[PDB]
Amino acid sequence: CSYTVSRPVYSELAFQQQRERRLPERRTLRDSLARSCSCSRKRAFGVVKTLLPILDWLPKYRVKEWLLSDIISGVSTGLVGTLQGMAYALLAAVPVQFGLYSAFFPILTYFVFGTSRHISVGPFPVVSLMVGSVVLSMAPDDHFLVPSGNGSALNSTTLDTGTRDAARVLLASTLTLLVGIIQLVFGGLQIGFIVRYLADPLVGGFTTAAAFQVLVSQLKIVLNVSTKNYNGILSIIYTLIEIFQNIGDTNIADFIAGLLTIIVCMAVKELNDRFKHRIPVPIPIEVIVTIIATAISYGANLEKNYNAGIVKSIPSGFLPPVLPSVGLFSDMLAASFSIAVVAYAIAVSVGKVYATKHDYVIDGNQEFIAFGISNVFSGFFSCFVATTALSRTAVQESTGGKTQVAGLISAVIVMVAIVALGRLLEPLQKSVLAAVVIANLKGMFMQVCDVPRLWKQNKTDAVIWVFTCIMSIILGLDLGLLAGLLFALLTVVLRVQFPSWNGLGSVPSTDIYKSITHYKNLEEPEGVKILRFSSPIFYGNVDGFKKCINSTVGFDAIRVYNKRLKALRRIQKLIKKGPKVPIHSLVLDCGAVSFLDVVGVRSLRMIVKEFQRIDVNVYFALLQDDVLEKMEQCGFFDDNIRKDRFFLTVHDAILHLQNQVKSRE
Amino acid sequence: CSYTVSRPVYSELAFQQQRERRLPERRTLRDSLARSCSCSRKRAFGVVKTLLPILDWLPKYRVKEWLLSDIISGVSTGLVGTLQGMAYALLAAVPVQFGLYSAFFPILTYFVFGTSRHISVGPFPVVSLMVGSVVLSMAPDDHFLVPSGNGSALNSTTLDTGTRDAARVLLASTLTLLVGIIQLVFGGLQIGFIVRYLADPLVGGFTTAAAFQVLVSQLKIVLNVSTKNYNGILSIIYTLIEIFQNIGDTNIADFIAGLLTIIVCMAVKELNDRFKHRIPVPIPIEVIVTIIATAISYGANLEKNYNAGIVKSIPSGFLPPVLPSVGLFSDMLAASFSIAVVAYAIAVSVGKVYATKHDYVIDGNQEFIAFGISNVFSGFFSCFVATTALSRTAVQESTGGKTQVAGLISAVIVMVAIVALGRLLEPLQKSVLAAVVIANLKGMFMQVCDVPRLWKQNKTDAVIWVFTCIMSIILGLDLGLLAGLLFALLTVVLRVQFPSWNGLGSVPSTDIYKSITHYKNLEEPEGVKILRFSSPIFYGNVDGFKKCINSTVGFDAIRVYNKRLKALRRIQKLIKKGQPKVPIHSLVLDCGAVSFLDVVGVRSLRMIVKEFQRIDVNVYFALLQDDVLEKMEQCGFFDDNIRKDRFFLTVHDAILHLQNQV
Ligand SMILES: [Cl-]
């Protein structure tokens, strides 16, 4: 219909006279914490059910067909997960058995404390790369070589194959324990707002750079070259230059096999993803390619006749739990925090995706606690940080998964692949394991295709993407994330420091005020100059407010008053011998302000005082109640700056000005 | 007075269909690159006037309270300038001969270039150790170490002199020139917006521990306690516990001398503040306590008969300008960059602290080139860096002082002290001049009284003030301002992430919408609620905006959807076998205080509309004035069903829309 109102001009004081405010609630800190301390059985049962979600979905099972669905999804996910674990084990500088270890125990630990249903907790390429990088930093290769072997000229300081793996495994276990402790601290203390700073473009650029580094590392492993574990600044660029310079020490057979399996896996994966309408179950190309590689590699002696690179270092058994080597937390706290936050971000992303796909809820703090307990249990059994791979989770969701029982069954596959089966994978070339990782990088590599899309969108979001992607390549990968969050916060500060001020005017015979730089036929008040200033004024943008006012009024309240004083002394000397023309008022439409930052209210009062000397009134239009309640406490309403200066709506100020001009010439 | 604003309800598409837009000017730089200053001489005269900040206040000062006020203030800050030059030179591992030059030459070039009063340019204590650190690193202590002198057993490895200090001064002179040219090149690209990030609590919380740092640094010289040099973390605490641990070897004669002078100087200072209406000109007790100290010392020989500590090393005569070594600028470039940043930080910090007591707000771009060329002019003469001490700027402002001319007359006092008045201030006990800085230090020590004042005004800046103070004590003055600057920006992003969201409600028989948590006797439309986030929806407050909705509507759109389909599948199988929703119709987000949006915000805001659409509950919007609206349609917010009709110009138009719809 229509919109018509009629009311007196309640500016600021005509509103608080006949409006009984709501008294604040009594704090009573003692009784508040006493009442907050729950003691009834209802809250106890609630927190028990929340902390241990295993007792929720288990009694209400649908065993009839869920048993078959879970067993088939479990065998499929177990095969895929043991393959991905034995592949990512190379990224953690640990033998091939510890990937299967980190694929078995975290599942058992997440089964009794997790809150998801489709998340396959296991290894991850980015997390494994970060773990390997921090292990190489804390334990380089040239720190274990033992002089033995009667060398030609000097002492035979060859490789330390053996006890080196034990030190690397102990370091990885300590890192996993520290990451679990950090995650438990973040979860229990309810400090979960720290992961909100990981924006979508930021995490996209970080995943792109991490996928590029994973590609570099896996190409190094495939070519069978020997680098010097370049870590720190420009690590990826330096190791890529070294690879390009050390091409001569390659293996033609290993390179050919790697390229062949890369092409085959990529083609089969693209065919299965595109033509899904003909094949419902995704073909496990990884499983069949690993089987055929183990078959061919055992037919001919690829180790002796072709000098290939195989694992052949499987003990095929378990080991008693070992206590973590405490003392290395101070030199790895930042790395553990980075690994924990990136793992939690990836886990929450995968969980939200596969939860909005299946329409169920996933709690954040519960996932934090579950992953913390999982990493703590993994630290006692020599495992690395566990996460949920996008490719590994997709298999369990595509084959059909309802509860975590499929994951529990997925551990049984790794179980049987640990105890007895597994030594058949002895002649498996390391190139095949190092190739499937590259084939799975297609998802994070296509993330580069969003920069042309984000650039047409809000440009500041695209700059964060490019900055995070580039900076996470120059100064390593762990320190690259810290340079991204700080840059994102600085970009947020820049958007509130440089607002979009306009010349707000009124449409003819209306009450709504729109900008003047975007419309043509708008009427402005005679003498009055309206100004709207978003991005609330704080200590960093108050000079911007001064400059904006000086630009929108045409003059400066300082220079005009100085010229008036200079002309005044000329008057008092001539009688003894014997600028601000169009501007009538200034209506500040500060309606988009949230905080006031008293450091800024000081300058606001200074502006109001300076404009009074030049006889130019400066009013306010749409200030909020919580802002006036703060300006009152900050010492702003003196005997001269009353409340009549402020207003409720933008049109009320113009109406009051017109009435004052009509009633007072 | 009522007013008739009868107007049909206008949505976004209903307001742009009859009005017209304005073609935005792209303003390409291919043809507009010569629009700043092409031929107009007015802009050329303006930049020259701002480049030379001497034709502004010098042809404008009033000699009424200028001559006698600044002269007595100049001798006060000039005396302190001599003491710091004689003290900081020894800490910089260089011979104590050029400290007076660092207080004479930089003031001359800064008197004409630079508009910042109540600042005495010269050496700074924490910046002098940084110079001595990079000098001792790139210059061995023993250059030749001549093994001659017929020692006890082996050759007497006497430390080489003459050429040693000459190389140290040469290295220090090159460092000042390198910091100067780097200070100037920063002013080239006009990066002067960094001064806007220094808030009053930031500079206030910074110049209170520095006042405590200058207190303990003058306390170790007033007690003659030989302590080691400490910098970095826990620098102030380690020096404080060292004095209390090494308090034994304290000169009793010098202790009772300084303690008697610190009392008599502050007593007459507050006496002048009480009787300021009786005596027009403030009596310069600084020059009074100085002449009486040299009188009682020269007439009693407090050094060779009492061991009180005197200067006894005042040099004489200027030195010709010496050319630096260009071949060594490359090595200093890696370390002088960090020193150059912290130098300008302290330089402007002592400028903003006095901007709160007098309306003398300064600009960063002009001060960056002012201290820049001054250190360049400090070069070629073997001077120090062009910083400004916290003790000299306190004694100048508290004891009168109107313009920067007090620094000019101060150099004249040092100019005559080096050529003709060297033997005059010889027996100075180094206590009446090292304790006078403590008297004028009350101007910054009393700045801790704003903590209960700022706490009652705004809790955020009160925490910022105390945070920078306690952090500058632990992490030193170097990393104190940097850690406080990041903490200051962190409070800005936190206050914009967690706003004061409240549900709004109209007043009876009117169209004014205010918060319902702060008022009574309000009314809410049956089935329609209002929510005002009052903050931009960026990547940080994405879930916070979601938690703002589900806590205001009572339910959660996620949990009511899965239970709805669960009951739907429950009743579906019962048909084959055989057979908590709130009445709120819609919600209008009063997101009118938003200033910017991001890709994460527009995506999450779209998911909210799609989520409530599945629950048969509509979601409407409010005033997206000019930018937040055009940014949404650019990020692909409207694809097939979501249109700009769901938006509204005013909050009451949204209420009237849902009213006549049902
Ligand atoms: Cl993956």
Coordinates of N, CA, C and O and ligand atoms in Angstrom, one line a residue, chain A residues 88 125 389 391 440, ligand 1:
Chain A
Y88 N 51.3 -41.3 1.7 CA 51.6 -40.1 2.5 C 52.7 -40.4 3.5 O 53.3 -39.4 4.1
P125 N 47.7 -34.9 2.6 CA 49.0 -34.5 2.0 C 49.6 -33.2 2.5 O 50.8 -33.1 2.7
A389 N 40.9 -36.5 4.3 CA 41.2 -36.2 2.9 C 39.9 -36.0 2.1 O 39.0 -36.8 2.3
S391 N 39.6 -36.7 -1.1 CA 39.4 -37.9 -1.9 C 39.1 -39.1 -1.1 O 38.2 -39.9 -1.6
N440 N 45.8 -37.0 -7.1 CA 44.7 -36.5 -6.2 C 44.8 -34.9 -6.0 O 43.9 -34.3 -5.4
Ligands
CL1 CL 43.9 -35.9 -1.0

